[PDB]
């Protein structure tokens, strides 16, 4: 094919402590390279590479422009925040948790345990592993947070132990969708 | 920062295609179908809660397009460097034989933002009930894209996610099968 030329624009709004503090970033990119941007923290335009130097100089001489972009944290950021909050910031879907053994080898051998937590939102989530009540802090490996691209996350957390008859293994998930932590037990 | 909202748009030559969308913590709130000039919500629900004047996106694209023409000249017409995508396949939830599930094809870290994605099941390409998302932003200014294939777990049927990207040496296939 023929060479592609790309123009990227990103209007970013960063919120902390509700809307107590807001940061607005208007960034211009050409072929994966940001050359000029507006940072509400600076107040005016700036270049990120030489091609922007001339641009910034021009724009920053238009008082009406800077004036307008400085209000963006309010008219744009804090406004949009109020329009979507109820279904994004507040969005909460409870985690679906299941446990099961992985790998495969006869009695008195290798074995792993799996805790599959999925379909939750937000992503901030905590998962632990207990054995007969004691918390396990050794043979645990996690996939880490995993986006699903449909407003839901999923995570897989494994624990390597040698299952003994009569034992009780528990997976504990703490998340914003539940007042009290969820638990799923597996009995050996 | 507890939350981040991003209005991300782009124009590409010579394909002459552009996109406009909103991102909330890595998720797509909505995007505008430049063709039909219609606001498209990631979740059918959001529609009832908020509203977006599609025309707003069109006007913006016009701006991006104009800067591209100028920036493209004042940069001795240097092309963009293709960056091949990393692909990953995963199920919506733990797979249970004959229990509705979903295959997820996550294409990440690629640019320019152009890709041909197809779902293969035992070789033959499927298109029944498939779905996808426009291109999503990244910290590094690369792109992410999701494709969904609703299916039915079975011991036979095998599945593939095919990704054609000018950065690849040939179509990339990430395999998935039940054990």
């Amino acid at each position: 094919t023929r060479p592609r030329f790309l123009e990227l624009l990103k209007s970013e709004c960063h919120f902390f402590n509700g809307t107590e503090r807001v940061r607005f970033l208007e960034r211009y990119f050409h072929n994966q390279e940001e050359f000029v941007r507006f940072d509400s923290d600076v107040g005016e335009y700036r270049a990120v590479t030489e091609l922007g130097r001339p641009v910034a100089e021009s724009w920053n001489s238009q008082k009406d422009l800077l004036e307008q972009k400085r209000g963006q944290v309010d008219t744009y950021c804090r406004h949009n925040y109020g329009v979507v909050e109820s279904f994004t910031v507040q969005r909460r879907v409870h985690p679906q948790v299941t446990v099961y053994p992985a790998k495969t080898q006869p009695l008195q051998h290798h074995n792993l345990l799996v805790c599959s937590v999925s379909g939750f939102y937000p992503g901030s989530i905590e998962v632990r592993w207990f054995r007969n009540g004691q918390e396990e802090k050794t043979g645990v490996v996690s996939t880490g947070l995993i986006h699903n691209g449909d407003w839901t996350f999923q995570t897989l957390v494994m624990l390597e132990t040698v299952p003994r008859s009569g034992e009780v293994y528990t997976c504990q998930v703490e998340h914003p969708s539940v007042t009290s932590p969820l638990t799923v037990e597996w009995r050996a | 920062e507890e939350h981040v909202i991003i209005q991300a748009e782009f124009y590409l030559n010579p394909d002459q295609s552009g996109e406009f969308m909103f991102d909330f913590d890595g998720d797509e709130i909505f995007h505008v179908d430049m063709a039909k000039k219609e606001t498209v919500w990631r979740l059918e629900e959001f529609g009832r809660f908020a509203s977006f004047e599609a025309q707003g996106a069109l006007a913006n694209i016009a701006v991006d397009k104009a800067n591209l023409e100028i920036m493209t000249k004042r940069s001795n017409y240097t092309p963009i460097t293709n960056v091949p995508p990393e692909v990953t396949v995963l199920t919506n939830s733990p797979v249970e034989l004959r229990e509705p599930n979903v295959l997820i094809c996550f294409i990440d870290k690629f640019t320019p933002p152009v890709v041909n994605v197809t779902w293969l099941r035992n070789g033959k390409p499927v298109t029944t009930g498939v779905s996808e998302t426009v291109f999503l932003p990244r910290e590094d200014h690369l792109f992410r894209k999701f494709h969904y294939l609703p299916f039915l777990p079975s011991t036979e049927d095998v599945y593939d996610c095919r990704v054609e990207h000018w950065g690849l040496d040939e179509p990339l296939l990430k395999h998935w099968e039940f054990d």
């Binding site: 624009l9 209007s11 | 209005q7 908020a50 004047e53 701006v63 104009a66």
Partner: peptide, 11 residues
């Protein structure tokens, strides 16, 4: 009710 767009500057 309405999500507002941030209109960029022309170079």
């Amino acid at each position: 009710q309405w999500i507002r767009v941030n209109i960029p500057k022309r170079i």
